[PDB]
Amino acid sequence: MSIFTPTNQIRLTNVAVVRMKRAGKRFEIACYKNKVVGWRSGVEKDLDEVLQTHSVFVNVSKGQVAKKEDLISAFGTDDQTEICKQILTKGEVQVSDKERHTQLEQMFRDIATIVADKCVNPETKRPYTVILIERAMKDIHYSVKTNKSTKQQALEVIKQLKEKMKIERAHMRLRFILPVNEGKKLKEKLKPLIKVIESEDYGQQLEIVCLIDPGCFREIDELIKKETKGKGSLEVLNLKDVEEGDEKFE
Amino acid sequence: MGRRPARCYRYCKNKPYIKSRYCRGVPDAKIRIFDLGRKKASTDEFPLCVHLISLEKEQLSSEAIEAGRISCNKYISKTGGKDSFHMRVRVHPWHVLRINKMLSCAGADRLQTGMRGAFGKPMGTVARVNIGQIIFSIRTRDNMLANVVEALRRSSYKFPGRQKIVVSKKWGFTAYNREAYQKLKADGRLMNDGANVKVITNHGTLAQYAKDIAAAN
RNA sequence: AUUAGCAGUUUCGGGGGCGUAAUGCUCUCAGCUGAUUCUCAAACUCUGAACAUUUUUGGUAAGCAGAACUGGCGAUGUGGGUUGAACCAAAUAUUGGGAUAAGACGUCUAACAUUCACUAAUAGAUACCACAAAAGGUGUUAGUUCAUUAAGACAGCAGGACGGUGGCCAUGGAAGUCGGUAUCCGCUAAGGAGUGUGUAACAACUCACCUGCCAAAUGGACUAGCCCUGAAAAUGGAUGA
RNA sequence: AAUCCAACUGUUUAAUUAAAACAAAGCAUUGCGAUAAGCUUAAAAGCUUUUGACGCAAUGUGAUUUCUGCCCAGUGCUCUGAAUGUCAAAGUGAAGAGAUUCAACCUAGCACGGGUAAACGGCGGGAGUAACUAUGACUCUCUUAAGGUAGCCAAAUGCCUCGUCAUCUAAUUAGUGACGCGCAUGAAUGGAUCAAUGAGAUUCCCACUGUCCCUAACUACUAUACAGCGAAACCACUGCAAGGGGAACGGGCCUUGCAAAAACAGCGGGGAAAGAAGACCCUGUUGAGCUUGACUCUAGUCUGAUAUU
RNA sequence: GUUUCAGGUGGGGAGUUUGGCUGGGGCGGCACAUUUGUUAAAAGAUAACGCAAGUGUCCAAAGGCAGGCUCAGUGAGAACAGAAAUCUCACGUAGAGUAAAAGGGCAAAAGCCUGCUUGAUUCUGAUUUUCAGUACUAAUCGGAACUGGGAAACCAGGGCCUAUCGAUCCUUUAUGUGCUUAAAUCUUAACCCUAGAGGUGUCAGAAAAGUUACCACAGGGAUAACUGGCUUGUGGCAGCCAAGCGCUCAUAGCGACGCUGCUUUUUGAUCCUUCGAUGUCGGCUCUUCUUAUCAUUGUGAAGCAGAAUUCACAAAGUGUUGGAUUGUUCACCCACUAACAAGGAACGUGAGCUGGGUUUAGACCGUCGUGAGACAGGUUAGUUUUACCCUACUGUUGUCAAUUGUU
RNA sequence: ACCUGCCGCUACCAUCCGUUGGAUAAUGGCUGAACGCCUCUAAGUCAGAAUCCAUUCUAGAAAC
């Protein structure tokens, strides 16, 4: 050249790294961003079709191949077949853009599908309106993160829906089993707190009091009624959140 | 093929690698099924035979073979009744093709896993033939012949190299012509075994048809 | 290693009508065993071969890498292949005449005559060697098969191309012909319950099918020679010109 | 208009780097009461000491502010430690004619046991689990002791990555706010913020519109001639091109296109131009500088003994 | 204290190392010693990081020998007992077994079972295998001593055979009424003579860690990075066939499964040319070129009523944009437009540019590393020299001396 | 220095100017056989692109 030497750096980065941190040692595989994803959600093609290299590195970028001994130490296996598979299944993948987008979409769907229980119905129902939930998610400007789980996100979104504004929703039917004469007292107590229907009064028999309680703070609620009553008792539930009752503004 | 375009597996070279106790990653062949039509149909009931045969020694892929078979599969209602149809291929892709892969597909230069230890993983299963070895065969009744040759015609396109179609003078899957394969029935010295034939045993057997009579039933 | 049905079976596996499920009858499946066939195996064999070419290993392949035999550029050029380390001819003291070699013999450029076919293509023209394929072609040449034909043909044009009957279906209707099925007979040289066009559908025309005339050849199906199609890449352009 | 950094004032690479580097006060640690600390010298002898802890010597951090969470397992550093192991030379005994040989007793150090993390450093992996509704508070376990606390962040620290959401724009891989199971952030390895400052790095807006749309004008070295003024330059040969084959991009060879002295001023298309027996790269049984629980060594040192005594 | 010696400390310093092969080199693996099978082209011989496997051991028996017996498997019977226990008889030229790999060899055995033994003993001579006809490993044959087995012939140099290992020195062990210690002949003590073990795995034998982005040297195109050369897996592009899509309808328009191609505008494979240096990437600038025609023109199709598209041909004559973002081609939006089509030309163009990156010295962060330091990890700052030569080109003088009359 | 500012040079930062014949391509035909028909084709030939070549335009040959 002169002094002017075409380096253009070590060897091109252009594939999914799958970083497995076993025995405190990084082992990696040449695959593709999509292929690995496909493999790990059902589409079991071929082991060297999903892998652009059917061998294992320690640094895919720098072009370094691991010691057999290291593999043995870590995985208790020598054959690259098994090791490679392991890496594929339980190592840190690099998704594409497409895959990322898909993931995002999935998350979006499951913060309206989970919120379909606590759905945004118009003036009257028209009970589902799941499309409208989805629509609303980005009208408030929400970070639909794929790091966090769906349930957590659902919790977050309902709080925002309060300051949309269209009120928080999460109502079910708690059928409280209440024995002896304190049941009546309890009923009297909790009438301004939440709604009371399908009631009965009994001194020599259990009382099936059906209430309409918060569903996303339900366990806590359950805990603080028994204590109030004094005596131990049973208070059954549905599942988590249901759309049997009214979900217009409630 | 999938990893290759069949231009590197066009011509016969290197000694035969197979699905063995030395290979093992060897994939399953693209067809393990080789007959099409009435396999119950008799040696006698069908007396018409056409072959497909290469003129050049070439390695036909298993996929290719499959494709060929599923022309003649579909040329059957067009022919007229699957009842009047047999097929057997008579070329099974025993032999396996090697592929050292080029680890670089979007970038990254080896000179370390380049062409050193660069020995193929077996991918590809394939059949060798020569300058006349059969590659499809069709037994049938004497009704369909312009039909079967057209199926073959389709098959011809699905195969590498210059093929050829010859009508045998036999009854289809038999070593006797017709001049012979009436004399066997006519004289009545034939012995039947379903799709095949046997013939009685005089110059076939002698040491075991010396003091024997059960050998003329 | 591995495909195909066939046979004798199976209260020894299982399910159907009969029978105790049946393995008994009548069907299929499963397993065993007997007779045959498909394809076959570098690491198998009952058996067995006298850098250039031939063999061969890896490789998608490379002017890649790697072996075998022999041959070649090393004290080896000359003549030839337009030109050229490997191809041929063939070995190099200095000469003359001769006759050949390889290769040429329009002109380049020493070297011509004849004779027969082929091609009509911006084609094609000195192995190596500087590219061409599968598949197409009513281009022309050669050729092979079987068929039609003096009961008169081909090609053409002229005439006829009917009835039971709107067969049964579907269907106001679809009558040969939205579409489907069975698809039979009468009379005739002659006519499919019909090849298409067309009609809401019938019809009409056209075909199959039959005769008139002209007057002797005709029809298909392949086969391989040259030519064409395929056949696009980068300064202007190379059968060497 | 704001972000990153460094506080500043200051300083530096004797010919590419003035920087965010260095420095710096402020904060902290250790050493040390004279025959001390630290260091210099073969030797003798010295310096800090024109000294005495409100100090000297050695480190780290780096102004202020607000903080510095846990770990002595490892490595280092220390110890009036248990030990009653190992333990050299000397000396002691035994044995053997002797040479010599074999026993105890046994220093420091190592081994051992405690101390120490503003010394180096580290601050998880798996089960459940705050309706796994869950970010992982909490429990249980495993190693290598502890298991990332407060802060902070796609930051100059984030591969995936143009991360997601938000703004700024007509349009933004740029910036900035937010989010943050953080490839691989984080508390004097100092963490967090920030006034003042900055030939500092980034952005955005106003900002005098020849950078550009698209150039022009004009004013100044060239050209000419005079002198000193084809110095230096040059150096296989030379210099017309198209394909070909050729150690595989020929100016020479093959075959083609073509061409007619001598010159001028510009041009940078070529001469695989010129400037260095390439430093990138790899080979040499070729070296250096530095490192370290390489191999070997050594001053210095700590301990033991003889002798002076 | 001072000598004088000894033990530890001792990268504060001293000197020196730091394998080899290798489709660049390191990461990798061992193909570095040896075995079998194939590679191996019917003696031998015959390579790669060629393929499938093995070796550093294991055995008082898993050695020697003699005698007896017959295994794997299957059939038919038989309290418990059936798919399995054990007991018969049938068939069984081996389908078993034989330390292990694989191939071979083997039935009055080479297997199993018994019995007795320790030829897994020593001296000496020859050979083979590899080969230099050197060593060693291994193996073979013949003798002499001494033993063993069995009547006896016979067999017995370890394992049925092909692998299961190692110089000199220096030690250490055995051997001998051994030799030698050269001024008293003795005593040891030592050395020798003879034969073994200690082990070198890089295996005919380099006591032996790192790094250098502060580096240096002799060299190398034998050996990488840009270029060109082959190639075309991969990239793009093109066909051929026609199951299907397409209301109907294979081919208007597509076209599965499958096959043949071109291409050198992707990248790899490669290492032929260049390391006594072709100035690496991008963007500006500019010509020219190719067509695989985006527009244009002239046409032919359509599932073409029109407009609007879609497909085909001739055709490269002319056109093929302004920005935002990014070092940037590539990329990714906005914006106009007839269209914003693909490319080439030493990945056109550094004595045309800036240097944005990349590629040195300074630094920062992260990660890794005991550390010196590393990072196709980011970050920031970091001299683009020479034409006055030859040509080619731009324009300009001069010549046209046989462009014929002194012109 | 500033405001004017001539000649001059210059700005799609101004103005004026950039043609027409044959030859073909694809393609559409015509007559028309090979092959009594039939066919744009074989003989023969009609139309016909930004094409081709001329016309127009720059230079003007060791050319007259």
Short mmCIF file of N, CA, C and O (backbone and C1' of nucleotides) in Angstrom, two decimals, chain E residues 296-299 313-315 317 400-401 403, chain F residues 25-28 48-52 62 64:
data_model
loop_
_atom_site.label_atom_id
_atom_site.label_comp_id
_atom_site.label_asym_id
_atom_site.label_seq_id
_atom_site.Cartn_x
_atom_site.Cartn_y
_atom_site.Cartn_z
P U E 296 -43.46 6.64 -20.89
"O5'" U E 296 -42.62 7.33 -22.05
"C5'" U E 296 -42.37 8.75 -22.03
"C4'" U E 296 -41.21 9.10 -22.91
"C3'" U E 296 -41.35 8.69 -24.36
"O3'" U E 296 -42.28 9.58 -24.97
"C1'" U E 296 -39.09 8.47 -23.61
P U E 297 -43.66 9.02 -25.54
"O5'" U E 297 -43.27 8.60 -27.03
"C5'" U E 297 -42.46 9.46 -27.85
"C4'" U E 297 -41.87 8.72 -29.02
"C3'" U E 297 -42.73 7.66 -29.67
"O3'" U E 297 -43.69 8.24 -30.52
"C1'" U E 297 -40.58 6.79 -29.32
P G E 298 -45.03 7.46 -30.82
"O5'" G E 298 -44.49 6.15 -31.55
"C5'" G E 298 -43.85 6.24 -32.84
"C4'" G E 298 -43.51 4.86 -33.33
"C3'" G E 298 -44.57 3.81 -33.10
"O3'" G E 298 -45.76 3.99 -33.84
"C1'" G E 298 -42.49 2.89 -32.55
P U E 299 -47.11 3.39 -33.27
"O5'" U E 299 -47.00 1.87 -33.74
"C5'" U E 299 -47.41 0.76 -32.92
"C4'" U E 299 -46.47 -0.40 -33.10
"C3'" U E 299 -46.93 -1.70 -32.47
"O3'" U E 299 -47.85 -2.43 -33.29
"C1'" U E 299 -44.76 -1.22 -31.71
P C E 313 -38.96 -9.08 -23.86
"O5'" C E 313 -38.83 -8.45 -25.31
"C5'" C E 313 -38.81 -9.32 -26.44
"C4'" C E 313 -39.27 -8.58 -27.67
"C3'" C E 313 -38.31 -7.54 -28.19
"O3'" C E 313 -37.27 -8.20 -28.90
"C1'" C E 313 -40.52 -6.71 -28.26
P A E 314 -35.79 -7.67 -28.78
"O5'" A E 314 -35.84 -6.32 -29.61
"C5'" A E 314 -36.00 -6.39 -31.03
"C4'" A E 314 -36.17 -5.01 -31.60
"C3'" A E 314 -35.07 -4.03 -31.26
"O3'" A E 314 -34.05 -4.22 -32.21
"C1'" A E 314 -37.22 -3.00 -31.14
P A E 315 -32.55 -4.07 -31.77
"O5'" A E 315 -32.57 -2.69 -30.96
"C5'" A E 315 -32.61 -1.44 -31.67
"C4'" A E 315 -33.00 -0.28 -30.77
"C3'" A E 315 -32.18 -0.05 -29.51
"O3'" A E 315 -30.88 0.47 -29.74
"C1'" A E 315 -34.46 0.34 -29.04
P G E 317 -26.23 5.28 -27.84
"O5'" G E 317 -27.32 6.39 -28.17
"C5'" G E 317 -27.61 6.75 -29.53
"C4'" G E 317 -28.51 7.97 -29.60
"C3'" G E 317 -28.71 8.79 -28.34
"O3'" G E 317 -27.60 9.65 -28.06
"C1'" G E 317 -30.81 8.42 -29.36
P C E 400 7.44 24.33 -45.40
"O5'" C E 400 6.48 23.19 -45.97
"C5'" C E 400 6.96 21.85 -46.12
"C4'" C E 400 5.81 20.88 -46.19
"C3'" C E 400 4.88 21.04 -47.38
"O3'" C E 400 5.36 20.69 -48.68
"C1'" C E 400 3.60 20.67 -45.41
P A E 401 6.25 19.37 -48.96
"O5'" A E 401 7.74 19.93 -48.91
"C5'" A E 401 8.21 20.88 -49.90
"C4'" A E 401 9.72 20.81 -50.08
"C3'" A E 401 10.44 19.53 -49.64
"O3'" A E 401 10.35 18.52 -50.64
"C1'" A E 401 11.64 21.45 -48.89
P U E 403 4.37 15.54 -52.96
"O5'" U E 403 3.43 16.83 -52.97
"C5'" U E 403 3.63 17.94 -52.06
"C4'" U E 403 2.35 18.74 -51.93
"C3'" U E 403 2.18 19.92 -52.87
"O3'" U E 403 1.86 19.50 -54.20
"C1'" U E 403 1.31 20.40 -50.69
P A F 25 -36.32 -4.01 -41.84
"O5'" A F 25 -36.18 -3.83 -40.26
"C5'" A F 25 -34.95 -4.13 -39.56
"C4'" A F 25 -35.14 -4.06 -38.06
"C3'" A F 25 -36.47 -4.58 -37.52
"O3'" A F 25 -36.44 -6.00 -37.48
"C1'" A F 25 -35.96 -2.52 -36.49
P A F 26 -37.72 -6.85 -37.93
"O5'" A F 26 -38.62 -6.82 -36.62
"C5'" A F 26 -38.06 -7.12 -35.33
"C4'" A F 26 -38.88 -6.47 -34.26
"C3'" A F 26 -40.38 -6.65 -34.40
"O3'" A F 26 -40.77 -7.88 -33.81
"C1'" A F 26 -39.91 -4.38 -34.06
P U F 27 -41.67 -8.89 -34.63
"O5'" U F 27 -42.98 -8.05 -34.94
"C5'" U F 27 -43.73 -7.46 -33.87
"C4'" U F 27 -44.51 -6.28 -34.37
"C3'" U F 27 -45.46 -6.56 -35.51
"O3'" U F 27 -46.58 -7.29 -35.04
"C1'" U F 27 -44.27 -4.60 -35.98
P G F 28 -47.29 -8.35 -36.00
"O5'" G F 28 -48.12 -7.42 -36.98
"C5'" G F 28 -48.94 -6.35 -36.46
"C4'" G F 28 -49.62 -5.57 -37.55
"C3'" G F 28 -49.96 -6.36 -38.80
"O3'" G F 28 -51.13 -7.13 -38.60
"C1'" G F 28 -48.91 -4.36 -39.44
P G F 48 -44.80 5.59 -43.95
"O5'" G F 48 -44.05 4.91 -42.71
"C5'" G F 48 -44.69 4.88 -41.42
"C4'" G F 48 -44.04 3.87 -40.50
"C3'" G F 48 -42.65 4.21 -39.99
"O3'" G F 48 -42.76 5.08 -38.87
"C1'" G F 48 -42.76 1.92 -40.62
P A F 49 -41.92 6.44 -38.79
"O5'" A F 49 -41.21 6.35 -37.36
"C5'" A F 49 -40.93 5.09 -36.71
"C4'" A F 49 -40.54 5.29 -35.26
"C3'" A F 49 -39.41 6.29 -35.00
"O3'" A F 49 -40.02 7.52 -34.61
"C1'" A F 49 -38.85 4.18 -34.07
P A F 50 -39.20 8.90 -34.69
"O5'" A F 50 -38.11 8.75 -33.53
"C5'" A F 50 -36.83 9.40 -33.67
"C4'" A F 50 -36.15 9.56 -32.33
"C3'" A F 50 -34.81 8.84 -32.15
"O3'" A F 50 -33.73 9.71 -32.45
"C1'" A F 50 -36.15 8.91 -30.16
P U F 51 -32.59 9.27 -33.48
"O5'" U F 51 -32.71 7.68 -33.52
"C5'" U F 51 -32.19 6.86 -32.46
"C4'" U F 51 -32.05 5.45 -32.93
"C3'" U F 51 -31.23 5.29 -34.19
"O3'" U F 51 -29.87 5.27 -33.77
"C1'" U F 51 -33.28 4.14 -34.46
P C F 52 -28.80 6.30 -34.37
"O5'" C F 52 -28.40 5.64 -35.75
"C5'" C F 52 -28.16 4.22 -35.84
"C4'" C F 52 -28.16 3.78 -37.28
"C3'" C F 52 -27.57 4.78 -38.26
"O3'" C F 52 -26.16 4.60 -38.25
"C1'" C F 52 -29.67 4.08 -39.05
P A F 62 -0.96 16.17 -43.43
"O5'" A F 62 -0.14 16.38 -44.78
"C5'" A F 62 -0.68 16.13 -46.10
"C4'" A F 62 0.21 15.14 -46.82
"C3'" A F 62 0.35 13.76 -46.16
"O3'" A F 62 0.24 12.76 -47.19
"C1'" A F 62 2.48 14.83 -46.29
P C F 64 -2.32 16.20 -52.86
"O5'" C F 64 -3.65 16.72 -53.56
"C5'" C F 64 -3.91 16.49 -54.96
"C4'" C F 64 -5.32 16.90 -55.31
"C3'" C F 64 -5.47 18.21 -56.08
"O3'" C F 64 -5.20 18.06 -57.47
"C1'" C F 64 -7.00 18.21 -54.27
#
